Amino acid sequence: QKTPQIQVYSRHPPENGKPNILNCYVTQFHPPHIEIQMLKNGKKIPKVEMSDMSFSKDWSFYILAHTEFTPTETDTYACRVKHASMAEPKTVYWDRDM
Amino acid sequence: PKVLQIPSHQIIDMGQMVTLNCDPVSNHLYFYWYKQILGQQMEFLVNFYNGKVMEKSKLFKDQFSVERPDGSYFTLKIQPTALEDSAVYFCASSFWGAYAEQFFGPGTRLTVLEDLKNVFPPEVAVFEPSEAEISHTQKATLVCLATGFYPDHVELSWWVNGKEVHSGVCTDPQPLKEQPALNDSRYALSSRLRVSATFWQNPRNHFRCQVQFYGLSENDEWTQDRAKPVTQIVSAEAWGRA
Amino acid sequence: NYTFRCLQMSSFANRSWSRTDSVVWLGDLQTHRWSNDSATISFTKPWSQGKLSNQQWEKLQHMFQVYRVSFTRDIQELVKMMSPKEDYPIEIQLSAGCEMYPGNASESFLHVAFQGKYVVRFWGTSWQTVPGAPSWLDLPIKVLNADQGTSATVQMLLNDTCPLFVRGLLEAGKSDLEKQEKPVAWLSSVPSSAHGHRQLVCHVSGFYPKPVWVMWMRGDQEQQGTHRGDFLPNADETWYLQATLDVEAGEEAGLACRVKHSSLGGQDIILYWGSLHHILDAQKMVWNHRHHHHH
Amino acid sequence: QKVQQSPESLSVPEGGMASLNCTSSDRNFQYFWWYRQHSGEGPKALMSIFSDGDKKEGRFTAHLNKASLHVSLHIRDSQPSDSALYFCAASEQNNYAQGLTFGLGTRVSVFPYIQNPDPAVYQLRDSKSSDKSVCLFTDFDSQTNVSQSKDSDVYITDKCVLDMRSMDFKSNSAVAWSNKSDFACANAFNNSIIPEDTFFP
Ligand SMILES: *[C@@H]1O[C@H](CO)[C@@H](O[C@@H]2O[C@H](CO)[C@@H](O[C@@H]3O[C@H](CO)[C@@H](O)[C@H](O[C@H]4O[C@H](CO)[C@@H](O)[C@H](O)[C@@H]4O)[C@@H]3O)[C@H](O)[C@H]2NC(C)=O)[C@H](O)[C@H]1NC(C)=O
Ligand SMILES: *[C@@H]1O[C@H](CO)[C@@H](O[C@@H]2O[C@H](CO)[C@@H](O)[C@H](O)[C@H]2NC(C)=O)[C@H](O)[C@H]1NC(C)=O
Ligand SMILES: *[C@@H]1O[C@H](CO)[C@@H](O)[C@H](O)[C@H]1NC(C)=O
């Protein structure tokens, strides 16, 4: 088993009020069975699109979650990931300054 | 584990619909039909898989139709029939469509004729061994002659004392036309059986030449006032001479 | 030089539950996807069929469909023979394709990993275990090699089909493979990590093809303490990359992020830290916070 | 033609060797199959040969040279069971659903060695009524070739090989008959190259 690495980032510069796309890049995991959730203020985003699952040179799996979003000064965005290698779901919050 | 074909031989009149049956190998996916003219050139006709035709040759006319319904034979229909369609039809099945062994069936001998008036069964006669040969070689060769049969639908077999023998038997591979100049000439076939002089000299030994002809069905109409040339057996017998 | 990759993901939970999903890539572009629920291989680009005729593609799909079915039956049966008896869950991954070289030169490959560990390869005319693979695999391999129709099919797929298909695929999708997508850059700062230090982030997004150059500069002097991050994919089949610089308070002045990429055409993105373009970007990208780092 | 085979026909002694040759005229038709059909049956595949070099399956070896599109078949220790029509089929490269492209085939005839030939022609009388007569040319060597009939009234069959399993004896035989009363066994087979040591009753 391999613990997944979650990376949350916007497609275009995080200008407020401007429609953008928020990406969540889950990598370095094994087995391929995973549950990826995208959150808006801790509430499940419904229209989340997923990339087809694939794997890297080291046989470890990778997947890209992404949703259309209009970032604001006051809202928070996160990626909740459930995987066999973890006892508790990991939640990485979108931090546009990193 | 063998591709089966029903019937072995079939005689049909021009224009009529004919169905050639085939039972492929169980677990095989890709099915085939081949046409073989005069036991020489083997011609591909059709490739059938998933319930559709996957590949067809130029030889696969609009008269030909192929299908495999669930629980029944892989068939080949010919409607209407033409004189040129007289050939041996081979069924074949494989696990793959290419690069894997195709398993062939015994084939069906289709014979499309202008009129069935040309169909004649064989006249079988056994020729007793030469007394010269018995004294010169101490071996007795007896020859069988099957004559005046049309079409080339014959199976010759030797029967000694009620049992079919294969040792010392030599049937001709292909028969000969009585009139090679004629388009529709009756064929003739011969076979030879050799036994020791001591065996032939015994008058208690019974030697029989059996010829199985593949003629017409009861469905076919016979207008001419002669015996019907059906799928019959014409056997000729002889005893040992002391 | 391009590499064509068919990535098969097979998962076996029990004697009844199994799942086989495949994804196909020509370089960093997805060309196909074949999910268990779909009975046919689906194209992800207009040029995914390459220069193959509809009949040619159909013939290929038919054998692939037969393969998927047979492959599940075959593994489920080899699981019974495998020791220890039934080690569920079973994770089998298959990596097959060819690498294209100039001219008619190409090199095919078929690699298999059991439980995420590379164990088997198809080499020449037979399936073979790789050095280090578990000794119990030798028997199922001998059994696999008995299938004459499988070795013949795999040989044609690898030797002929793969390079022939890719040759026509590169021709059909050249416009899309040779696409130049302009990057876009922006700046940010975070109080990480050592006391009295501030990390300066340079974000670069939407560039294609993959190779770039992102460096923090102080005039013409390349700042040696630049940490380039990993390439992160975007949904539109472009790339994201970031460069960080840890600097003491006030040392931010005079710094600039320089971005060099093929699509720009010599007109490099230069973002000056402190500049009006920078203040005007900062002003529209603000949010409510305090920073946390896990890395 | 797409698949050229040589020779048209071949005759090999028992225990002897036979080489069969086959060439493809199309560069795409580079993958080969060797099929064998016994007179009046459905063909049986001997072996496939998709990679260059030799493929030995017992007494049978197939060699391939894709570079020159040439495939061959070598039979060692030829047996009478090997007497058949040898077909060379070619499969098109990168085509997953296709038929076979057979050549005209090679007629292979495995003949036996005659230790002591006693060539003679005998007159055989019918079992039912003497009205019919046949001429049997038997016990001749394998070198002797029975030639085809010139006269249309007289029919002469091709050479035939009998095997007396119990006795371990084999003999060649030709049969001739005529509907015409003006027929003699001495003045029969005249068109054929019969040896001078021939016996006549
Ligand atoms: C698909 O591609 C693979 C390669 O990636 C290919 O496998 C190779 O096929 C060739 C030929 O069939 C093999 O080469 C032979 O190897 C042996 C020894 O290893 C040699 O005996 C061979 O013969 C040579 O030697 C003779 C002298 O004694 C010469 O007379 C003769 O001319 C030869 O030079 C020959 O070199 C090779 O082993 C494999 N490669 C591997 C890794 O196994 C395969 O054939 C292709 N399949 C298809 C259907 O095209
Ligand atoms: C998708 O995954 C499932 C899981 O095995 C496959 O469903 C099985 O398929 C066969 C034949 O259709 C059935 O006998 C089984 O009952 C199914 N098993 C289960 C657990 O559902 C399915 O075949 C795969 N999808 C496709 C298109 O093949
Ligand atoms: C087989 O696997 C599935 C899901 O992984 C599970 O729900 C199912 O109960 C399993 N079968 C049995 C008999 O437990």
PDB file of C-alpha atoms in Angstrom, chain A:
ATOM      1  CA  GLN A   1       0.000   0.000   0.000  1.00  0.00           C
ATOM      2  CA  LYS A   2       1.033   3.607  -0.794  1.00  0.00           C
ATOM      3  CA  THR A   3      -0.345   6.829   0.878  1.00  0.00           C
ATOM      4  CA  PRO A   4      -1.716   9.347  -1.665  1.00  0.00           C
ATOM      5  CA  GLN A   5      -0.305  12.871  -2.181  1.00  0.00           C
ATOM      6  CA  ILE A   6      -3.015  15.523  -2.666  1.00  0.00           C
ATOM      7  CA  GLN A   7      -2.193  18.841  -4.483  1.00  0.00           C
ATOM      8  CA  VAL A   8      -4.920  21.521  -4.891  1.00  0.00           C
ATOM      9  CA  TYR A   9      -4.366  24.432  -7.364  1.00  0.00           C
ATOM     10  CA  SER A  10      -6.383  26.826  -9.633  1.00  0.00           C
ATOM     11  CA  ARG A  11      -6.045  26.605 -13.494  1.00  0.00           C
ATOM     12  CA  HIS A  12      -5.931  30.383 -14.068  1.00  0.00           C
ATOM     13  CA  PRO A  13      -4.730  33.161 -11.618  1.00  0.00           C
ATOM     14  CA  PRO A  14      -7.018  33.217  -8.531  1.00  0.00           C
ATOM     15  CA  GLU A  15      -8.723  36.529  -9.462  1.00  0.00           C
ATOM     16  CA  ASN A  16     -11.873  36.928  -7.365  1.00  0.00           C
ATOM     17  CA  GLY A  17     -15.219  36.978  -9.145  1.00  0.00           C
ATOM     18  CA  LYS A  18     -13.640  35.543 -12.303  1.00  0.00           C
ATOM     19  CA  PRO A  19     -14.767  32.020 -13.334  1.00  0.00           C
ATOM     20  CA  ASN A  20     -11.848  29.580 -13.017  1.00  0.00           C
ATOM     21  CA  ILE A  21     -11.250  25.791 -12.668  1.00  0.00           C
ATOM     22  CA  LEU A  22      -9.915  24.239  -9.419  1.00  0.00           C
ATOM     23  CA  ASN A  23      -7.713  21.173  -9.808  1.00  0.00           C
ATOM     24  CA  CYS A  24      -7.015  18.444  -7.247  1.00  0.00           C
ATOM     25  CA  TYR A  25      -4.106  16.184  -8.178  1.00  0.00           C
ATOM     26  CA  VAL A  26      -4.026  12.879  -6.224  1.00  0.00           C
ATOM     27  CA  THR A  27      -0.815  10.798  -6.824  1.00  0.00           C
ATOM     28  CA  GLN A  28       1.554   8.082  -5.398  1.00  0.00           C
ATOM     29  CA  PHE A  29      -1.261   5.733  -4.290  1.00  0.00           C
ATOM     30  CA  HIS A  30      -1.908   1.983  -4.224  1.00  0.00           C
ATOM     31  CA  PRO A  31      -4.435   0.195  -4.583  1.00  0.00           C
ATOM     32  CA  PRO A  32      -6.315   2.087  -7.383  1.00  0.00           C
ATOM     33  CA  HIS A  33      -9.593   2.197  -5.368  1.00  0.00           C
ATOM     34  CA  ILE A  34      -9.937   5.794  -4.159  1.00  0.00           C
ATOM     35  CA  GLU A  35     -12.713   8.248  -3.161  1.00  0.00           C
ATOM     36  CA  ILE A  36     -12.032  11.938  -4.047  1.00  0.00           C
ATOM     37  CA  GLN A  37     -14.379  14.684  -2.789  1.00  0.00           C
ATOM     38  CA  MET A  38     -14.143  18.397  -3.657  1.00  0.00           C
ATOM     39  CA  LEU A  39     -15.531  20.807  -1.068  1.00  0.00           C
ATOM     40  CA  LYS A  40     -16.871  24.381  -1.074  1.00  0.00           C
ATOM     41  CA  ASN A  41     -16.888  25.655   2.549  1.00  0.00           C
ATOM     42  CA  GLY A  42     -16.778  22.012   3.715  1.00  0.00           C
ATOM     43  CA  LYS A  43     -19.877  21.085   1.638  1.00  0.00           C
ATOM     44  CA  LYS A  44     -19.559  18.487  -1.194  1.00  0.00           C
ATOM     45  CA  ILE A  45     -19.311  20.108  -4.694  1.00  0.00           C
ATOM     46  CA  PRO A  46     -21.646  18.125  -7.059  1.00  0.00           C
ATOM     47  CA  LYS A  47     -20.329  18.805 -10.638  1.00  0.00           C
ATOM     48  CA  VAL A  48     -16.811  17.386  -9.956  1.00  0.00           C
ATOM     49  CA  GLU A  49     -15.195  15.885 -13.091  1.00  0.00           C
ATOM     50  CA  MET A  50     -12.533  13.176 -12.885  1.00  0.00           C
ATOM     51  CA  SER A  51      -9.747  12.208 -15.232  1.00  0.00           C
ATOM     52  CA  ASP A  52      -9.461   8.542 -16.289  1.00  0.00           C
ATOM     53  CA  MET A  53      -7.250   6.667 -13.818  1.00  0.00           C
ATOM     54  CA  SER A  54      -3.654   6.089 -14.977  1.00  0.00           C
ATOM     55  CA  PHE A  55      -0.292   5.150 -13.329  1.00  0.00           C
ATOM     56  CA  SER A  56       3.321   6.407 -13.421  1.00  0.00           C
ATOM     57  CA  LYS A  57       6.754   4.858 -14.236  1.00  0.00           C
ATOM     58  CA  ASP A  58       6.841   3.472 -10.639  1.00  0.00           C
ATOM     59  CA  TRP A  59       3.457   1.683 -11.182  1.00  0.00           C
ATOM     60  CA  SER A  60       1.803   4.070  -8.619  1.00  0.00           C
ATOM     61  CA  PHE A  61      -1.618   5.525  -9.545  1.00  0.00           C
ATOM     62  CA  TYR A  62      -2.539   9.150 -10.304  1.00  0.00           C
ATOM     63  CA  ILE A  63      -5.850  10.994 -10.880  1.00  0.00           C
ATOM     64  CA  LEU A  64      -7.018  14.576 -11.477  1.00  0.00           C
ATOM     65  CA  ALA A  65     -10.259  15.953 -10.016  1.00  0.00           C
ATOM     66  CA  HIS A  66     -11.402  19.364 -11.255  1.00  0.00           C
ATOM     67  CA  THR A  67     -14.429  21.646 -10.951  1.00  0.00           C
ATOM     68  CA  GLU A  68     -15.581  24.981 -12.384  1.00  0.00           C
ATOM     69  CA  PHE A  69     -15.474  27.583  -9.596  1.00  0.00           C
ATOM     70  CA  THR A  70     -15.681  31.363  -9.070  1.00  0.00           C
ATOM     71  CA  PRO A  71     -13.164  32.130  -6.247  1.00  0.00           C
ATOM     72  CA  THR A  72     -14.071  34.807  -3.689  1.00  0.00           C
ATOM     73  CA  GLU A  73     -12.283  36.566  -0.814  1.00  0.00           C
ATOM     74  CA  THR A  74     -14.578  34.733   1.750  1.00  0.00           C
ATOM     75  CA  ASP A  75     -15.074  31.114   0.494  1.00  0.00           C
ATOM     76  CA  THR A  76     -12.794  28.117   1.247  1.00  0.00           C
ATOM     77  CA  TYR A  77     -12.101  25.131  -1.058  1.00  0.00           C
ATOM     78  CA  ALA A  78     -10.724  21.674  -0.157  1.00  0.00           C
ATOM     79  CA  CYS A  79     -10.051  18.147  -1.409  1.00  0.00           C
ATOM     80  CA  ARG A  80     -11.212  15.264   0.852  1.00  0.00           C
ATOM     81  CA  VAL A  81      -9.572  11.949  -0.103  1.00  0.00           C
ATOM     82  CA  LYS A  82     -10.517   8.474   1.270  1.00  0.00           C
ATOM     83  CA  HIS A  83      -7.975   5.670   0.615  1.00  0.00           C
ATOM     84  CA  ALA A  84      -7.273   2.189   2.104  1.00  0.00           C
ATOM     85  CA  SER A  85      -3.723   3.295   3.150  1.00  0.00           C
ATOM     86  CA  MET A  86      -5.235   5.921   5.519  1.00  0.00           C
ATOM     87  CA  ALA A  87      -7.217   5.342   8.721  1.00  0.00           C
ATOM     88  CA  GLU A  88      -8.776   8.841   8.420  1.00  0.00           C
ATOM     89  CA  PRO A  89      -9.599  10.882   5.224  1.00  0.00           C
ATOM     90  CA  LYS A  90      -6.956  13.532   4.350  1.00  0.00           C
ATOM     91  CA  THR A  91      -8.311  17.039   3.600  1.00  0.00           C
ATOM     92  CA  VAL A  92      -5.960  19.602   1.981  1.00  0.00           C
ATOM     93  CA  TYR A  93      -7.351  23.152   1.757  1.00  0.00           C
ATOM     94  CA  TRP A  94      -6.754  25.350  -1.319  1.00  0.00           C
ATOM     95  CA  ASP A  95      -4.177  28.020  -0.352  1.00  0.00           C
ATOM     96  CA  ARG A  96      -3.808  30.319  -3.419  1.00  0.00           C
ATOM     97  CA  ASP A  97      -0.634  31.916  -1.959  1.00  0.00           C
ATOM     98  CA  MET A  98       1.465  28.665  -2.098  1.00  0.00           C
TER      99      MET A  98
END
